[PDB]
């Protein structure tokens, strides 16, 4: 029980060991390459923890993923399996065996954004006090796969000459579109855009207006 490590000792040359974290670089939309450069390397180092954490509400010191890196001769990794389109808190420290050194510099980087996964969800049509309005809400968050910056809507009528589109901000839910043609069925699809690309879009509602400008539902039209 004599010749072993000085745990002092090991912990402040471990300490020393100062891991200067570089920017982040985003790789794709699941993972991003993280770099350091050591200044006075300990000559107690078995390698790297990576933690890392998508932004949002978390606990603290803890509340933490850890990647592990098993050699002190790497500089860089890549972290995988990241949400798409989200914010990460990155930082990490040398370690030998029990002992951990200091955190680095924490840094943010953005996984890329995808087009959402997912439709808006409730899409709604009906008559606007010949007008509709259409209503919808956002796709669930963890489908957006990034920010939502616009809704895109299709107002297709059965005779395809037929169609309106309009756009409308990623905080605005719904939309009024002004004139349909009476006696044509419309197909009306909502889709959500991200600064990847439109998502899929909702299946379609119907609607169809009398010369009144009144709704006239499926069940009606076969009278």
Known sequence: TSQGVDHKQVQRELGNA?????????????????HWTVDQQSQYIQGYKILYRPSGANHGES???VFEVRTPAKNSVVIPDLRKGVNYEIKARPFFNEFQGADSEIKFAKTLEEAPSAPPQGVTVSKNDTAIL??????????????????????????????????????????????????????????????????????????????????????????
């Open 18 to 34: 100062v891991l200067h974290l570089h920017n982040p670089t985003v790789l794709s939309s699941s993972s991003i390459e993280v």
């Open 63 to 65: 509340d933490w993923l």
């Open 134 to 223: 259409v209503s919808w809400q956002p796709p669930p968050e963890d489908t957006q796969n990034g920010m939502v910056q616009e809704y895109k809507v299709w107002c297709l009528g059965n005779e395809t000459r037929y169609h309106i589109n309009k756009t409308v901000d990623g905080s605005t839910f719904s939309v009024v579109i002004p004139f349909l043609v009476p006696g044509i069925r419309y197909s009306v699809e909502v889709a959500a855009s991200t600064g990847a690309g439109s998502g899929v879009k909702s299946e379609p509602q119907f609607i169809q207006l009398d010369a009144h400008g009144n709704p006239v539902s499926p069940e009606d039209r076969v009278s």
